[PDB]
Specification:
This is part of a larger assembly, with 2 copies of chain A, 3 copies of chain B, 1 copy of chain C and 1 copy of chain D.
Chain A lengths: L9 H9 L9 H15 L4 E2 L1 H28 L7 H11 L4
Helix pairs in contact in A: 3-4
Chain B lengths: L14 H10 L9 H26 L4 E2 L1 H10 L10
Chain D lengths: L13 H5 L6 H5 L13 H27 L4 E2 L1 H8 L3 H5 L5 E2 L27
Classes of the chains: A mainly alpha, B mainly alpha, C mainly alpha, D mainly alpha.
Chain D binds a DNA duplex through helix 2.
PDB class: gene regulation
Keywords: Chromatin Fiber, Linker Histone, Nucleosome, Genome Folding
Entry title: Structural basis for the linker histone H5-nucleosome binding and chromatin compaction
Chain lengths: 99, 86, 97, 126, 95, 97, 87
DNA sequence: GGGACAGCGCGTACGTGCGTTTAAGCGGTGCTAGAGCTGTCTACGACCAATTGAGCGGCCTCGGCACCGGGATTCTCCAGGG
DNA sequence: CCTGGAGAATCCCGGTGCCGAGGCCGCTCAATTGGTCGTAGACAGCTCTAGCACCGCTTAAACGCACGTACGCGCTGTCCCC
């Protein structure tokens, strides 16, 4: 075999990178356009400071990572290694973020 | 030759972006349906924050949104961000 | 007297083409295509506007019927852009003078 | 309307007040010639002229784009046909409308290619 | 090689050749314009019948329009009206 | 030297698509147009524009039909187009009405 | 009310024998499994397009209930005309 | 025309579930039953367009000729032969 | 190796310039009326509660109606000269 790292094991290498580093894992410019787009629905004629966009990203990173960490415990309870939108929908309900 | 009004606004969060956040949670692999769901849960989360953020901005009678308004929105929502302070 | 007036939109189409692209020319034969295209679309929108008034017991035509006719003819992007252009035209008229 | 002033001949054309290109007086001139309705309000001629201008401008811009691909500075009816048959929204309109001295887009099917039921080829667009 | 040798024709028009003037190569180019790879031998006679039916329907309205105008010339304005009603509206002949 | 069947067809496909021409010979079409209208009305005169307009609509209708019949052939397993395809296409398109 | 916002939920469960009866009405005798899904899709696409004219006509009249007359106006615009439900 | 050439068009014997009636029990969506106002089209009065023709002068288009890119042969390599 | 399409030097298409023509787009007043802005009086449709037997909808299931599989030619495709 051409020394292909196992699909299960490639996560472990990716684990040690993100568990050791502090960074932002969402593209900035696509997020910049998305944040500017959702504003038009509620309030048009608006500008956006760079600090405001970064702060919105920082909340998003912690929101999803906390969702991912809690959803993993949902998967470990369901006897499956994989997380599923079944668990994510439950995670939003129990955390109170669904409504 | 040219495509229409816009693209990648909400689809700009591709599979690696979700996977990198998934690798942050410790998981190994995902089902394929998460990618549409993660974009959806991101959209509702931003909408809740951005609704509060523009509300402060409108009260300030300015057309620019600052991090202070975002912090105020996040602090009240239970998602307080201690960064980007004075 | 060869004074008979032919309502041709070639000059107006040419002026619009010049504004968007000063360096792009137009063939004489291709002018008739746009002129007939304008007349056909004009009849389509006017015909829809007339039918709307008859169905709604209305003896007048205003911007509302044209906006309704545009939505009944043009698809999504084309209708919303035409409506936006049409909405801006009537609003500016009330204040231009 | 008590408008006796310096100018009493022609202040501005009805289309020129807003800044439009297609005149609106001509549209209103013979609008009632066709028996569409009676007592036409002022909104309809302005709305109809504007939407016609938007449609006319879009076709011309796309025709110029197709003209540049063909190394021509003049809008040949082939350029107009390419614009019409390149957008699904524009495809529905003029579905069976014939364009004089125009043309049809260079479409081909896979089985016409030498390899039966296959159109892999090499780098050729579409 | 010399002379006609067979199949030669020096009889032009004279109540003939009106619809048979659309020879096999003429039909081929129309087929190639739409895009074909091979056409059967029966498509040539069928094409002439198909074209005639479409022309007959359009010209039937056109002559009716001309007679109402009390004129003998048939203009591009009369034929385009027939196409417009049928749905095959033709641009470029509006003047 | 010798072109095997199907080789020149592909080249001719890519040529006629980008061209602007009339594929029906001019002189036989004028005789055909006059004859069909001769029985409907005896004393008639034909303008040059009307003949050009009739040819373009007739050719484009046949060209559009050929495209549909080409897609009728791909529905079957035969590259060749038979009268089975044309007659079926006419019924679906509503021509036989 | 108004508790339903998104249209993700589908209530378009067309019945299979109804498709068989509709197909057999047109002369069909052997229906495959993949036919059923697209048969609903064709109906959905046709219903979507005809209803676009109905809402536009309804909004122009400032109505809350679509009348049969508005349907005839929408139907006759698209080439498929129904008789007896309007005029 | 004359052989090989690849599936898919019938029909088996057998599982899988959704289909149209039958009692019965809490609701739905139009029609009235009323009024108070918006739309909707009638009269006025000194004028505003935009239409209809006319003299002058300065401007726009097919013609030809230089280019540089597209049509022709003659070798270079991707197509079934050794 | 020719096949049959593609590249750099000669040759064909789009450009610029100048003349008098005689109608077109640009103002220019005349005259009766005519739409938008205010009121008019009359009835129509839109929301919420009532009566009493219908109607749609789900499981109770075991005989027959078709897509998957193997066979068999039988039609069509392509290569070769006048």
């Amino acid at each position: 075999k051409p020394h292909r790292y196992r699909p299960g094991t490639v996560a472990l290498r990716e684990i040690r990178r993100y568990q050791k580093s502090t960074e932002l894992l969402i593209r900035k410019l696509p997020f910049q356009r998305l944040v500017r787009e959702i504003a038009q629905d509620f309030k048009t004629d608006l500008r956006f400071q760079s600090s405001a966009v970064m702060a919105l990203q920082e909340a998003s990173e912690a929101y999803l990572v906390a969702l991912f960490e809690d959803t993993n415990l949902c998967a470990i309870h369901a006897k499956r290694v994989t997380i599923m939108p079944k668990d994510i929908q439950l995670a939003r309900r129990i955390r109170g973020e669904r409504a | 030759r040219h495509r229409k009004v816009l693209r990648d606004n909400i689809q700009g969060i591709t599979k690696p972006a979700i996977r990198r956040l998934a690798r942050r949670g410790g998981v190994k692999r995902i089902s394929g349906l998460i990618y549409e769901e993660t974009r959806g849960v991101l959209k509702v989360f931003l909408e809740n924050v951005i609704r509060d953020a523009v509300t402060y901005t409108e009260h300030a009678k300015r057309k620019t949104v600052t991090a202070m308004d975002v912090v105020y929105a996040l602090k009240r929502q239970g998602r307080t961000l201690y960064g980007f302070g004075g | 007297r060869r004074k008979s007036r032919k309502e041709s939109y070639a000059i107006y189409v040419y002026k619009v083409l010049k504004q968007v692209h000063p360096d792009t020319g137009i063939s004489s034969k291709a002018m008739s295509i746009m002129n007939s295209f304008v007349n056909d679309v004009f009849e389509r929108i006017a015909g829809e506007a007339s039918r709307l008034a008859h169905y709604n017991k209305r003896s007048t035509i205003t911007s509302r019927e044209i906006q309704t006719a545009v939505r009944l003819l043009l698809p999504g992007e084309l209708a919303k852009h035409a409506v936006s252009e049409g909405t801006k035209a009537v609003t500016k008229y009330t204040s231009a003078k | 309307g008590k408008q006796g002033g310096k100018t009493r001949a022609k202040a501005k054309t009805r289309s020129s007040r807003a800044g439009l290109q297609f005149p609106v007086g001509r549209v209103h001139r013979l609008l009632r010639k066709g028996n569409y309705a009676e007592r036409v309000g002022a909104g309809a001629p302005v709305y109809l002229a504007a939407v016609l201008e938007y449609l006319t401008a879009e076709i011309l811009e796309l025709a110029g784009n197709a003209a540049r691909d063909n190394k021509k500075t003049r809008i040949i009816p082939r350029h107009l046909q390419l614009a019409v048959r390149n957008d699904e929204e524009l495809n529905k309109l003029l579905g069976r409308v014939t364009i004089a001295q125009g043309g049809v887009l260079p479409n081909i099917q896979s089985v016409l290619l030498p390899k039966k039921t296959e159109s892999s080829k090499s780098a050729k667009s579409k």
